[PDB]
């Protein structure tokens, strides 16, 4: 449908198509695909895991029974012991930190299980299992529709404006549609994004830059946002690729030197971006939601496929415009439909659960992205 395709081209250009992953459908439902792993380091092979089980959990009472040449693992990372009694000289009570110290002081050594070809082939050793699984799910294509191209005396007005009006009105209608769609995307993204939480929520409470807290510069938020990106790096094999925030949350609040107003409009920045941050990421802005929040997360691809995302979008065409003369009024109806969903496997142990849930059911997917986080922000209204 070339006329709808032309409207598609002229309408999807108006939404934040890159803050979600984009896939497409041709079905009444969209088959979506995505990638997930539940714990990141070294090999994921059975041989690896078994050797790890067979050496030690590095408990506090056992860390000193280790000597030169021994292996140990902690938090699934295998380390070799350099010289005797590693940690003998480390008073640190938090074993994880003691380990970090031991690595630096060369008491232990990050250990690689890489080996000769012969070792592997001779023993008929096991092999790395997959880190990530590839999931598939489907959701219904959902829609919205408008009766907004009002005509009658309006036709007369449009005739007066007849030099532009035919196309102008369809483009305008498409624009308001795009606006609600963009907002719909944001609602889903907002919902799925995990609540960023550190020590009882972002330093033991949601960041608060209110008058009674820290009406500073907005620096403390910029710092927190940058940390949100760190969180993404910690939990997933990706760096943040986008950020969206309200004006009061960051689009304006961080404009104290840690936000750039699109100095350049064509390099590493979409046409729909409000700007970008000093810590990168094209920056988007919602402007609608009562939340006044910040979202940090990642969209990523393998070749042409946007397989990674918290939310996936899959439009379905064969942007329909219909002209109907109710009585005296040949108004223009506009219909747009698409699938939009979160990866349901983030709320499932396996397919038996995935098969009874819906990635489009945002009452379940709420807070379960893992490819995005949200910062609640209290502000100096």
């Amino acid at each position: 449908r070339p006329n709808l395709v032309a409207l598609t081209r002229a309408t999807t250009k108006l939404i934040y198509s890159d803050i979600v992953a984009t896939q497409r459908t041709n079905q009444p439902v969209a088959a979506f695909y995505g990638i997930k792993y539940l714990n990141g380091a070294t090999y994921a092979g059975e041989a690896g895991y078994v050797d790890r089980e067979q050496i030690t959990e590095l408990t506090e009472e056992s860390k000193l029974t280790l000597n030169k040449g021994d292996l140990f693992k902690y938090n699934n990372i295998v380390y070799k012991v350099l010289e005797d009694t590693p940690f003998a000289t480390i008073e640190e009570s938090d074993l994880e930190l003691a380990l970090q110290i031991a690595i630096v002081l060369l008491k232990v050594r990050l250990f690689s299980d890489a080996a000769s070809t012969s070792k592997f082939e001779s023993s008929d050793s096991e092999i790395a299992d997959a880190r990530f699984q590839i999931n598939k799910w489907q959701t219904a294509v959902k829609s919205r529709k408008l009766k907004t191209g009002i005509t009658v005396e309006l036709a007369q007005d449009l005739e007066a404006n007849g030099f532009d009006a035919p196309n102008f009105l369809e483009d305008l209608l498409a624009t308001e549609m795009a606006d609600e769609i963009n907002k719909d995307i944001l609602q889903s993204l907002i919902t799925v994004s995990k609540r960023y939480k550190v020590t009882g929520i972002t330093d033991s409470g949601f960041i608060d830059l209110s008058y009674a807290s820290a009406p500073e510069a907005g620096r403390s938020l910029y710092r927190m946002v940058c940390e949100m990106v760190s969180h993404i790096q910690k939990e997933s094999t990706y760096t943040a690729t986008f950020c969206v925030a309200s004006a009061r949350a960051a689009a304006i609040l961080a404009a104290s030197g840690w936000l750039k107003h699109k100095p350049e409009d064509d390099k590493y920045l979409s046409q729909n971006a409000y700007g970008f941050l000093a810590n990168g990421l094209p920056l988007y802005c919602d402007t609608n939601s009562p939340l006044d929040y910040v979202i940090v997360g990642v969209v990523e691809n393998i070749g042409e496929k946007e397989i990674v995302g918290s939310i996936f979008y899959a439009p379905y065409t064969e942007f329909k415009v219909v002209v109907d003369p109710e009585s005296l009024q040949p108004s223009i109806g506009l219909l747009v439909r698409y699938a939009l969903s979160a990866n349901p496997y983030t709320v499932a142990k396996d397919e038996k659960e995935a098969r009874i849930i819906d990635g489009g059911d945002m009452d379940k997917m709420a807070g379960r992205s893992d490819l995005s986080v949200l910062l609640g922000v209290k502000l100096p209204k």
Binding site: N26, Q27, K147, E318, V322, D324, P325, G333, L335
Partner: protein
């Protein structure tokens, strides 16, 4: 695929609008008594204390007990003479014989220029309309194309056209069954029957049948009786067709099966084209039979149709058919499509006031026990 081969058509080129129909214009026996010396061939009437009266023709020249002064005694003697075959009972046959004799005897040239018993007249009918709404959606129209390469509206149209034609054919049947007289009654009633209903489990209706086969044939025979009554009242002819419920049609179809097409070509080719808009076949080589796909209960109507379009008892005179309508509903922009016709109906006058339960061209019977 419109039925209507069982009606006059006489199509309109204007509503109001008219059709023609060949509307039909439409004994003092000596008593038998004690001491009566009958004479062979003579006909005597006798009122019995029980079960009314009889008309008996003498086969024997016998005196009926001159001592039978007691009506009870007289009835007994007459009964004995009847048992003897001396006196034989016929009812209308006797009335006719004496009436014809009386006319012959007192016949006169005079001026007995009677009329051919057909008035022949016409009715004015409006091109009464019927119409359907496709009531479909954009989303299916789009998905149908997108998913299977289907033509959407074109297919909806095919359904719609079929449905309006079926609904029209249905209406025709409702009119037939509105106006039809109820059969298995009167001249076609079995004394032990249930008044207008044929019950396949009832020994009377099934004529002493054994198992379903013979019970099914008994219905066939009730149909022939209905066909006769139609001829008797119409003055035009024996029922020529049957409209009946699927249950009835299957029953008839099971008997002398060559009468109907099982549509074995349809079954063989795995539902090539069900064509569920036509007549099944011809029962007994006499009645073209059609399935009422919307039968309300379970029934059969026998009807007459002469070769002349003016001899149906019911008329359909199409002026407009399948006019496609297209549109949309602006309240939500869903597409709109539909079909409209204008055809009108006619009914032999029989004087819809003079139609309900009065139409001599059709006899309807309710069926139980299938």
């Amino acid at each position: 695929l419109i039925a209507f081969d069982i009606c006059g058509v006489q199509p309109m080129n204007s509503p109001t609008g008219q059709v023609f129909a060949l509307r039909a214009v439409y004994k003092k026996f000596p008593a038998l008594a004690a001491s009566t010396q009958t004479t062979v061939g003579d006909i005597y009437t006798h009122f019995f204390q029980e079960t009314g009266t009889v008309y008996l023709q003498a086969s024997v020249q016998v005196t009926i007990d001159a001592g039978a002064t007691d009506a009870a005694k007289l009835d007994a003697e007459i009964k004995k003479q009847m048992e003897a075959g001396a006196l034989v009972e016929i009812a209308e046959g006797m009335a006719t014989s004496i009436a014809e004799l009386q006319e012959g005897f007192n016949g006169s040239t005079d001026n007995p220029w009677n009329e051919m018993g057909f008035r022949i007249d016409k009715q004015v009918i409006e091109a009464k309309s019927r119409q359907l709404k496709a009531a479909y959606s954009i989303e299916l129209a789009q998905d149908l194309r997108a998913v299977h390469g289907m033509d959407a509206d074109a297919e909806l149209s095919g359904i719609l056209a079929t449905e309006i034609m079926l609904e029209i054919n249905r209406e025709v049947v409702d009119w037939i069954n509105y106006s039809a007289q109820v059969g298995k009654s009167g001249m076609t009633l079995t004394p032990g029957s249930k008044a207008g209903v044929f019950d396949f489990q009832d020994p009377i209706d099934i004529r002493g049948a054994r198992w379903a086969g013979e019970s099914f044939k008994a219905l066939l025979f009730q149909i022939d009786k209905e066909a006769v009554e139609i001829a008797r009242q119409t003055g035009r002819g024996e029922g020529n067709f049957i409209i009946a419920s699927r249950n009835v049609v299957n029953v008839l179809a099971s008997v002398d099966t060559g009468i109907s097409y099982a549509a074995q070509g349809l079954a063989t080719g795995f539902s090539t084209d069900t064509t569920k808009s036509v007549f099944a076949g011809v029962l007994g080589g006499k009645y073209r039979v059609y399935i009422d796909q919307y039968a309300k209960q379970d029934y059969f109507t026998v009807g007459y149709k002469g070769p002349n379009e003016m001899d149906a008892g019911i008329y359909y005179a199409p002026y407009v058919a399948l006019t496609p309508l297209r549109g949309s509903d602006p309240k939500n922009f869903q597409p709109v499509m539909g079909f409209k016709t204008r055809y009108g109906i006619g009914i032999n006058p029989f004087a819809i006031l003079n139609s309900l339960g009065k139409n001599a061209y059709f006899r309807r019977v309710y069926v139980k026990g299938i």
